[PDB]
Design a protein around this ligand. Structure first.
Ligand SMILES: *[C@@H]1O[C@H](CO)[C@@H](O[C@@H]2O[C@H](CO)[C@@H](O[C@@H]3O[C@H](CO)[C@@H](O)[C@H](O)[C@@H]3O)[C@H](O)[C@H]2NC(C)=O)[C@H](O)[C@H]1NC(C)=O
Ligand SMILES: *[C@@H]1O[C@H](CO)[C@@H](O[C@@H]2O[C@H](CO)[C@@H](O[C@@H]3O[C@H](CO)[C@@H](O)[C@H](O)[C@@H]3O)[C@H](O)[C@H]2NC(C)=O)[C@H](O)[C@H]1NC(C)=O
Ligand SMILES: *[C@@H]1O[C@H](CO)[C@@H](O[C@@H]2O[C@H](CO)[C@@H](O[C@@H]3O[C@H](CO)[C@@H](O)[C@H](O)[C@@H]3O)[C@H](O)[C@H]2NC(C)=O)[C@H](O)[C@H]1NC(C)=O
Ligand SMILES: *[C@@H]1O[C@H](CO)[C@@H](O[C@@H]2O[C@H](CO)[C@@H](O[C@@H]3O[C@H](CO)[C@@H](O)[C@H](O)[C@@H]3O)[C@H](O)[C@H]2NC(C)=O)[C@H](O)[C@H]1NC(C)=O
Ligand SMILES: *[C@@H]1O[C@H](CO)[C@@H](O[C@@H]2O[C@H](CO)[C@@H](O)[C@H](O)[C@H]2NC(C)=O)[C@H](O)[C@H]1NC(C)=O
Ligand SMILES: *[C@@H]1O[C@H](CO)[C@@H](O[C@@H]2O[C@H](CO)[C@@H](O)[C@H](O)[C@H]2NC(C)=O)[C@H](O)[C@H]1NC(C)=O
Ligand SMILES: *[C@@H]1O[C@H](CO)[C@@H](O[C@@H]2O[C@H](CO)[C@@H](O)[C@H](O)[C@H]2NC(C)=O)[C@H](O)[C@H]1NC(C)=O
Ligand SMILES: *[C@@H]1O[C@H](CO)[C@@H](O[C@@H]2O[C@H](CO)[C@@H](O)[C@H](O)[C@H]2NC(C)=O)[C@H](O)[C@H]1NC(C)=O
Ligand SMILES: *[C@@H]1O[C@H](CO)[C@@H](O[C@@H]2O[C@H](CO)[C@@H](O)[C@H](O)[C@H]2NC(C)=O)[C@H](O)[C@H]1NC(C)=O
Ligand SMILES: *[C@@H]1O[C@H](CO)[C@@H](O[C@@H]2O[C@H](CO)[C@@H](O)[C@H](O)[C@H]2NC(C)=O)[C@H](O)[C@H]1NC(C)=O
Ligand SMILES: *[C@@H]1O[C@H](CO)[C@@H](O[C@@H]2O[C@H](CO)[C@@H](O)[C@H](O)[C@H]2NC(C)=O)[C@H](O)[C@H]1NC(C)=O
Ligand SMILES: *[C@@H]1O[C@H](CO)[C@@H](O[C@@H]2O[C@H](CO)[C@@H](O)[C@H](O)[C@H]2NC(C)=O)[C@H](O)[C@H]1NC(C)=O
Ligand SMILES: *[C@@H]1O[C@H](CO)[C@@H](O[C@@H]2O[C@H](CO)[C@@H](O)[C@H](O)[C@H]2NC(C)=O)[C@H](O)[C@H]1NC(C)=O
Ligand SMILES: *[C@@H]1O[C@H](CO)[C@@H](O)[C@H](O)[C@H]1NC(C)=O
Ligand SMILES: *[C@@H]1O[C@H](CO)[C@@H](O)[C@H](O)[C@H]1NC(C)=O
Ligand SMILES: *[C@@H]1O[C@H](CO)[C@@H](O)[C@H](O)[C@H]1NC(C)=O
Ligand SMILES: *[C@@H]1O[C@H](CO)[C@@H](O)[C@H](O)[C@H]1NC(C)=O
Ligand SMILES: *[C@@H]1O[C@H](CO)[C@@H](O)[C@H](O)[C@H]1NC(C)=O
Ligand SMILES: *[C@@H]1O[C@H](CO)[C@@H](O)[C@H](O)[C@H]1NC(C)=O
Ligand SMILES: *[C@@H]1O[C@H](CO)[C@@H](O)[C@H](O)[C@H]1NC(C)=O
Ligand SMILES: *[C@@H]1O[C@H](CO)[C@@H](O)[C@H](O)[C@H]1NC(C)=O
Ligand SMILES: *[C@@H]1O[C@H](CO)[C@@H](O)[C@H](O)[C@H]1NC(C)=O
Ligand SMILES: *[C@@H]1O[C@H](CO)[C@@H](O)[C@H](O)[C@H]1NC(C)=O
Ligand SMILES: *[C@@H]1O[C@H](CO)[C@@H](O)[C@H](O)[C@H]1NC(C)=O
Ligand SMILES: *[C@@H]1O[C@H](CO)[C@@H](O)[C@H](O)[C@H]1NC(C)=O
Ligand SMILES: *[C@@H]1O[C@H](CO)[C@@H](O)[C@H](O)[C@H]1NC(C)=O
Ligand SMILES: *[C@@H]1O[C@H](CO)[C@@H](O)[C@H](O)[C@H]1NC(C)=O
Ligand SMILES: *[C@@H]1O[C@H](CO)[C@@H](O)[C@H](O)[C@H]1NC(C)=O
Ligand SMILES: *[C@@H]1O[C@H](CO)[C@@H](O)[C@H](O)[C@H]1NC(C)=O
Lengths: 131, 445, 127, 130, 48
């Protein structure tokens, strides 16, 4: 295979698709993520996008994911948050509906993900100090 | 249960938020639009199926930002031009008699005055032609400009032109522009065919108050949009699926003469006219306007009662910019009388008309009495060929039992003109944070 | 409830007493004249955060708040016991004298991490 | 060993050197990588530099190199890009000549790297599901 | 140029000479006309 091109899905192409199908197009969204009145407005918008990106990277850095898109955690998933089958959410539900369905608990979820990793971090520490 | 939460980055989540858009142009350049980065060739259009977005106009910030950007660009464009402060002087003015007609009698005035020159030690007596709406009587009587008691203003430089070149609005990093591809998209509702785009299409920022000139056409039929159709105080936007041609002209062979008023700077006064002088006017085809009005009545019969008598009437009153259809034609501002276009009633069941237009030199068009702008004269006759694709109606409520419904042209605000074209676009904010359950755990090293 | 500490609350505390409240300080790093002034200060803050994150990413601490290195500490720079410096000494006092010797420490950490990466690459190549 | 001075190679000093010799001068370039008109122009320049560094960091972050300077990849190197011996491409060629040699295949390599890392993460997720 | 006179219209003796009634020729909206108008000023910001 030498005379073929490379074509991927466009920006937000899998917005209405399933979770399993939209999980393979996160790279394009991640890459697209990044007279003086006009200059001040443009620089303010660019800088605002910069703190939003750094805030997202900082929120991911406090967890056990140092930059990877897909990553697993050690905290258990509370069944009381959704009480639904994994097969039907990953095969018959988009990301928009899933986002508005659990829009409340995400914040407190982030908090456990954070402290948990904190104690988890010192876990390897009191083991790595045994060397 | 053997389930564990997992975080995902770059997930397609849309939130509604405020965002300052970026200017773009096709790109010698004029109208000072070079301050923004030019548009990128072949903009990407990505269709988004299996998703419905609840589009809602009259609350979108894109039209507000466009209005602010147009005001800022106009203010920055008028900055290098020279101010017209020495014009506020006593003007020994009189009427015109050379080949004047009956309808144009008293409209134009020949005013003579003393003005400074490049030498501050001496003055010079000059003369110029001013319209009746441009001068007011102080008491061969003395006259003065209409903007003398108000703040003075600059004039349009002869190098810059008023051509409404199309501009594009591109979203910054982390935001997206959604466009509704529905052929019969309503004012507010869930659009079935949504598609994201990097930059908006070519939007011409024209200036109009009653008839939408050079606007975007519809898809298959004329559309009626309104925030509250039952409210008489809300403007009714009408979009045409076919364009109604209009031919506006000024047969006056005006001559522009430059007189020195200071060091280097000069003022472009109206010299002697050439030949016969006639009133400027606009011609509209009777058949096309009649069938367009019939289509409009047919669409209004779907919202209200179809067995209700409908009638069109002219403007009630107020400012000249609201009552008369104000626009621009080759650098000359026109104020046409739309009484001949809204003088018909419709019951439940080759030839063209002319409209006289007045010409002013002091134009604000933004209700900003804080300042103005002097339109310099244009050499030769003025000719403009265009086509209206919309209307801004207003319901004259007060009746009962759904009877004698009347419509009058209005919409003095400048946001309706841009709302009729920026209704398809919407700004959304991308949220890359996502969570989902998966049967996996992080291995301990 | 749960109360750990606040921002910069362990300034006067010892080394060991301040060794577990570093994560809150870790997240703590992130008319037109006042607007441009605020924008300039904000850009400076972002630049400082990115510079610190870049220096951490150069070493073996790209995404970790606590990390050790295989370089031998040179006793000429400290000349003190571990318990004495970790139980009867603050961060400010140590910062008063480590400021002159932090450049050589940073340089040795960078070259050592590069050497470790080269050794890891050779180990992966030789399987 | 109390008066030992330490000096390193200068900024971009290993440009004319070989690939192996310049491979140990990455940390210096990585650390050295970072009245209204003057302020806005200098602010725009600094913001552009920060955005460029952010884009490069994100480019290395979407791959399996989130932080480490030297990193490998399971995808192989096809001979269509450059069919040269390892004994001479690392000891008889600089970074400038080598970059100018395959400058037309950088986008293809970047695309295959990102898709390979995406499928690698999916395979790792499926493996952790056992 | 200002033409100021002393005010003696129910003024306390402590301010005898502090307030001055000045008159001057100032331009109007029309650059070809001028008007004679008066105003009150203080002695601290007015010099001979
Ligand atoms: C929008 O929704 C429609 C309706 O679901 C999608 O069409 C079809 O969707 C299925 C499931 O996502 C695609 O996978 C197929 O599933 C069937 C079982 O139902 C299986 O037998 C097939 O082997 C295949 O795996 C299917 O390719 C797709 N298209 C068809 C039938 O032409 C549509 O894909 C959705 N749009 C987007 C952008 O996702
Ligand atoms: C507006 O009013 C002015 C006067 O206030 C009009 O100016 C007129 O200009 C013409 C042409 O320069 C003058 O004609 C003169 O003719 C004699 C020969 O008869 C010739 O020797 C002169 O050199 C000059 O060409 C005319 O006298 C003058 N009018 C007056 C009252 O002095 C101007 O034409 C008026 N504009 C309009 C549009 O009516
Ligand atoms: C609505 O669009 C039409 C065209 O689609 C506009 O008509 C065009 O207007 C421009 C500027 O007024 C005309 O350009 C002029 O051409 C003459 C030719 O000699 C030149 O001497 C002038 O300096 C100027 O460049 C143009 O001819 C005219 N027609 C066409 C077919 O382009 C109309 O102005 C637009 N409406 C509004 C309100 O802007
Ligand atoms: C990478 O891409 C560039 C751009 O396509 C390549 O540069 C091009 O190289 C060819 C030769 O390889 C040049 O053709 C030359 O044409 C002249 C006139 O016909 C002829 O006299 C020469 O003998 C030679 O055939 C071409 O001008 C040049 N530039 C462009 C814009 O095409 C480059 O070769 C590519 N490198 C690799 C390794 O693929
Ligand atoms: C989040 O929790 C609230 C309850 O605190 C859920 O109910 C909403 O409550 C607010 C006011 O408290 C109302 O304005 C909303 O209309 C309620 N929502 C609905 C659907 O009735 C809310 O549903 C929760 N959101 C989730 C779980 O996504
Ligand atoms: C322009 O200036 C001329 C002369 O300076 C004015 O003509 C006469 O000026 C004298 C003053 O020197 C007046 O007494 C006369 O009444 C003026 N004549 C007329 C017919 O008015 C002339 O009035 C000035 N023009 C304007 C518009 O002020
Ligand atoms: C849209 O217009 C209708 C008709 O005018 C409004 O309905 C009435 O509005 C007045 C004043 O707002 C109220 O006093 C009446 O009680 C309303 N009638 C009814 C039956 O509720 C309506 O409020 C407007 N706005 C919306 C959002 O529908
Ligand atoms: C405005 O003027 C144009 C002038 O081009 C008119 O265009 C006419 O179009 C028909 C259509 O086939 C031609 O047969 C005519 O020859 C054109 N006229 C001329 C003078 O060439 C257009 O009809 C006019 N519109 C209105 C409303 O008056
Ligand atoms: C009338 O409006 C249309 C659409 O806004 C303008 O566009 C042209 O319309 C004609 C006839 O419908 C088409 O054949 C052309 O392909 C359209 N595009 C161009 C670039 O010409 C049209 O220009 C308007 N009429 C006038 C006289 O300006
Ligand atoms: C300030 O210093 C005192 C003493 O140096 C600290 O008191 C110690 O507190 C810890 C627990 O917080 C005890 O285990 C020690 O025994 C205490 N020391 C003594 C000598 O009794 C105090 O915590 C310090 N406060 C801060 C904010 O650093
Ligand atoms: C770090 O550097 C400073 C300045 O280079 C050193 O300060 C010296 O302090 C001593 C005693 O306080 C003075 O006699 C010297 O004159 C200072 N130096 C200079 C250049 O003025 C400081 O001692 C250094 N730290 C260590 C641990 O050596
Ligand atoms: C520039 O090239 C020369 C020539 O290779 C380098 O000098 C050394 O030359 C001997 C010749 O036998 C080689 O064996 C050495 O390997 C070369 N040194 C190195 C470090 O490779 C010289 O170092 C080069 N300098 C730069 C700045 O690239
Ligand atoms: C304002 O101007 C008038 C003139 O228009 C001054 O009145 C006198 O004018 C004559 C000439 O007609 C001069 O010779 C006199 O010197 C002027 N002054 C007086 C006091 O007679 C008037 O004085 C001016 N006012 C001020 C405050 O300067
Ligand atoms: C290069 O070769 C590998 C296997 O040797 C193959 O998978 C890849 O598709 C090839 N690429 C090109 C561009 O030929
Ligand atoms: C899950 O949520 C419920 C309340 O919704 C809470 O009581 C419980 O402690 C949570 N955790 C587990 C493991 O059930
Ligand atoms: C969930 O799936 C299991 C088997 O996979 C099934 O027995 C159960 O009924 C499902 N529950 C719901 C609510 O669909
Ligand atoms: C200026 O004069 C016109 C003439 O009628 C008047 O309508 C307007 O209100 C005046 N403006 C001011 C600010 O005096
Ligand atoms: C369509 O818009 C009109 C005008 O606002 C409104 O009266 C009507 O309810 C709308 N219909 C739908 C289905 O949204
Ligand atoms: C206007 O007058 C000038 C004077 O020379 C003439 O050349 C031109 O043809 C006239 N234009 C018209 C439309 O009559
Ligand atoms: C407009 O129509 C009138 C007849 O009603 C005609 O005399 C005039 O020449 C026309 N003007 C244009 C520009 O077509
Ligand atoms: C307008 O069109 C309608 C078509 O229903 C026709 O009945 C009517 O006579 C027309 N009016 C004029 C003035 O042409
Ligand atoms: C027109 O009005 C009559 C009155 O009852 C109604 O029956 C009919 O459905 C209406 N037609 C349309 C197309 O609205
Ligand atoms: C509207 O029309 C009526 C009747 O023709 C007329 O009296 C009135 O002055 C007109 N108003 C405007 C603003 O044209
Ligand atoms: C517009 O024309 C009608 C026709 O009679 C006239 O009554 C009305 O006064 C005109 N409007 C203006 C503002 O002159
Ligand atoms: C408006 O329509 C009436 C209806 O007969 C007519 O008498 C009048 O002349 C018309 N006015 C204009 C300006 O067309
Ligand atoms: C370390 O501790 C020992 C035992 O207390 C003491 O003798 C020695 O002086 C200490 N070292 C220093 C540098 O003070
Ligand atoms: C202490 O530092 C010097 C550099 O100043 C270095 O050469 C020496 O090897 C170091 N000593 C030890 C034991 O690491
Ligand atoms: C590359 O290596 C092969 C042996 O593996 C040798 O035959 C060939 O000459 C070498 N080519 C170069 C350019 O060194
Ligand atoms: C005004 O009062 C001051 C202070 O008493 C005095 O010096 C001056 O001569 C007075 N001027 C006149 C005109 O009375």
């Amino acid at each position: 295979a030498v005379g073929i091109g490379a074509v991927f899905l466009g920006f937000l192409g899998a917005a209405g698709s399933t979770m399993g199908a939209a999980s393979m197009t996160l790279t394009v969204q991640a890459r697209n993520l990044l007279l003086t009145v006009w200059g001040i407005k443009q620089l303010q918008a660019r800088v605002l996008a910069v703190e939003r990106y750094l805030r997202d990277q900082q929120l991911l850095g406090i967890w056990g994911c140092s930059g990877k898109l897909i990553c697993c955690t050690n905290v258990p998933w509370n069944s009381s948050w959704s009480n639904r089958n994994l097969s039907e959410i990953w095969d018959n539900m988009t990301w928009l509906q899933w986002d508005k369905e659990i829009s409340n608990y995400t914040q407190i979820i982030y908090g456990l993900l954070e402290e948990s990793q904190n104690q988890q971090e010192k876990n390897e520490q009191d083991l790595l100090a045994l060397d | 249960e053997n389930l564990w939460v997992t975080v995902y980055y770059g997930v397609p989540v849309w939130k509604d938020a405020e965002t300052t858009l970026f200017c773009a142009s096709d790109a010698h350049n004029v109208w000072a639009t070079h301050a923004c980065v030019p548009t990128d060739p072949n903009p990407q259009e990505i269709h988004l199926e299996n998703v419905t977005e609840e589009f809602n106009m009259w609350k979108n910030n894109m039209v507000e930002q466009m209005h602010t950007d147009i005001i800022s660009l106009w203010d920055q464009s008028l900055k290098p031009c020279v101010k017209l402060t020495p014009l506020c002087v006593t003007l020994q003015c009189t009427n015109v008699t050379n080949n004047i007609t009956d309808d144009m009698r008293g409209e134009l005035k020949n005013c003579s005055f003393n003005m400074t020159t490049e030498l501050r030690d001496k003055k010079q007596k000059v003369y110029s032609l001013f319209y009746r709406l441009d001068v007011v009587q102080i008491n061969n009587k003395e006259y003065r400009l209409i903007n003398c008691n108000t703040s003075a203003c600059t004039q349009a430089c002869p190098k810059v032109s008023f051509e409404p070149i199309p501009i594009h609005y591109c979203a910054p990093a982390g935001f997206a522009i959604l466009k509704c591809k529905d052929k019969k998209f309503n004012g507010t509702g869930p659009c079935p065919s949504v598609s994201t785009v990097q930059c908006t299409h070519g939007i011409k920022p024209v200036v109009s108050t009653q008839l939408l000139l050079n606007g975007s056409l519809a898809e298959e039929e004329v559309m009626i949009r309104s925030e509250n159709i039952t409210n008489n105080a809300k403007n009714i936007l009408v979009q045409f699926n076919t364009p109604v041609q209009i031919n506006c002209t000024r047969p006056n062979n005006n001559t522009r003469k430059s007189i020195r008023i200071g060091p280097g700077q000069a003022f472009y006064a109206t010299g002697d006219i050439i030949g016969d002088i006639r009133q400027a006017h606009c011609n509209v085809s009777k058949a096309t306007w009649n069938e367009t009005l019939g289509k409009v009545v047919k669409q209004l019969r779907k919202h209200f009662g179809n067995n209700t008598i409908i009638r069109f009437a002219n403007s009630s009153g107020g400012d000249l910019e609201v009552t008369t259809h104000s626009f621009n034609c080759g650098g000359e501002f026109f104020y046409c009388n739309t009484s001949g276009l809204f003088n018909s009633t419709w019951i439940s069941n080759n030839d063209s008309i002319t409209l006289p237009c007045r010409i002013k030199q002091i134009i604000n068009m933004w209700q900003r009495i804080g300042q103005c702008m002097y339109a310099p004269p244009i050499q030769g006759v003025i000719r403009c060929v265009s086509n209206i694709t919309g209307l801004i109606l207003t319901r004259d409520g007060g009746s009962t039992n759904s009877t004698t419904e009347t419509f009058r042209p209005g919409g003095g605000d400048m946001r309706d003109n841009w709302r009729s074209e920026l209704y398809k676009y919407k700004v959304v904010k991308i949220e890359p944070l996502g969570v989902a359950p998966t049967r996996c755990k992080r291995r301990v090293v």
